Design a protein around this ligand. Structure first.
Ligand SMILES: CCCn1c(=O)c2[nH]c(-c3ccc(OCC(=O)NCCN)cc3)nc2n(CCC)c1=O
Length: 291
């Protein structure tokens, strides 16, 4: 009952953490910029983790009896909160690039309306993809509970070719390669901006201070994105060994859940990574708590 306790501990932190973030964005209007619109999506997503994803993962770990629809949802719900966080983290990457690359067209393109528009689309695509196994890509009844109910054991109810080719490579590895590819252009150009501002006949520390505050936000966004891959790769890497190499000793359970716990921990780093990186956030929280 240790894994249960640990999973329950993360559930609390994942709620309190991201809920606190959603509150600070509501109170302090200095955080209600188009950028943090996606951050809220990342928060809400990482809230449902400690609200449904984890409660589901703890239930499906022991396995239960239910229809294919009810079983797949409880099995592929985490794939929704994981996919949404991909779009949120991707947008934040693009966004931070737009600000540094084209600061002028930033306010013209990056609008508080298009943001809410893309987010909605991202969520819709997150359910279509994250719940593709529910469309037909499943192992329900492939060569106890009785007719009508299927032993809801994930590895038995959800394919591996999907978790690898479709989910991992295409819906995780590729994005994280675009994201990393984006940050490559960000800091590469950001340091060029500082070099051009190095041959200017005037001080203009305003464009510098603003540039260093745009980079300080693009870097903070890089650390948020970086922690995602750092907390999901282990789980996927494990599934690449089991699939591509049937011979390779199927990963142990004591090491399997660790890659699962690590994936639920990612939902908690975001709140704490704001209170540290962004000085504007920590002061906002500090006020909420006291009062
Ligand atoms: C790309 C990842 C694909 N993928 C998995 O490979 C996976 N594996 C397990 C999984 C779950 C429980 C296990 O043992 C529980 C146990 O006995 N613990 C004892 C601790 N002392 C083993 C494996 N859940 C998984 N899910 C999530 C499905 C909702 C998933 O999406």
């Amino acid at each position: 009952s240790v894994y249960i306790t640990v999973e329950l501990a993360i559930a609390v932190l994942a709620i309190l953490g991201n809920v606190l973030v959603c509150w600070a964005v509501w109170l302090n209007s200095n955080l209600q910029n188009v950028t943090n619109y996606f951050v809220v999506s990342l928060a809400a997503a990482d809230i449902l983790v400690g609200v449904l994803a984890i409660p589901f993962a703890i239930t499906i770990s022991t396995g239960f009896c239910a229809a294919c629809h009810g079983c797949l949802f409880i099995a592929c719900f985490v794939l929704v909160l994981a996919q949404s966080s991909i779009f949120s983290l991707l947008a934040i990457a693009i966004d931070r690039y737009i600000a540094i690359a084209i600061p002028l067209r930033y306010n013209g393109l990056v609008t508080g309306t298009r943001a809410a528009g893309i987010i909605a689309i991202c969520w819709v695509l997150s359910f279509a993809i994250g719940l593709t196994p529910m469309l037909g890509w499943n192992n329900c009844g492939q060569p106890g509970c009785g007719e009508g109910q299927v032993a809801c054991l994930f590895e038995d109810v959800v394919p591996m070719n999907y978790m690898v080719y479709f989910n991992f490579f295409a819906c995780v590895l590729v994005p994280l390669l675009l994201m990393l590819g984006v940050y490559l252009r960000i800091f590469a150009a950001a340091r060029r901006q500082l070099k051009q501002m190095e041959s200017q006949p005037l001080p203009g520390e305003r464009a510098r201070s603003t540039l260093q505050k745009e980079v300080h936000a693009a870097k903070s966004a890089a650390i948020i994105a970086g922690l995602f891959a750092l907390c999901w790769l282990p789980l996927h890497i494990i599934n690449c060994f089991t699939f591509f190499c049937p011979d390779c000793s199927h990963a142990p359970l004591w090491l399997m859940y660790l890659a699962i716990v690590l994936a639920h921990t990612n939902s908690v780093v975001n709140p704490f990574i704001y209170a540290y990186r962004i000085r504007e956030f920590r002061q906002t929280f500090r006020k909420i708590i006291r009062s």
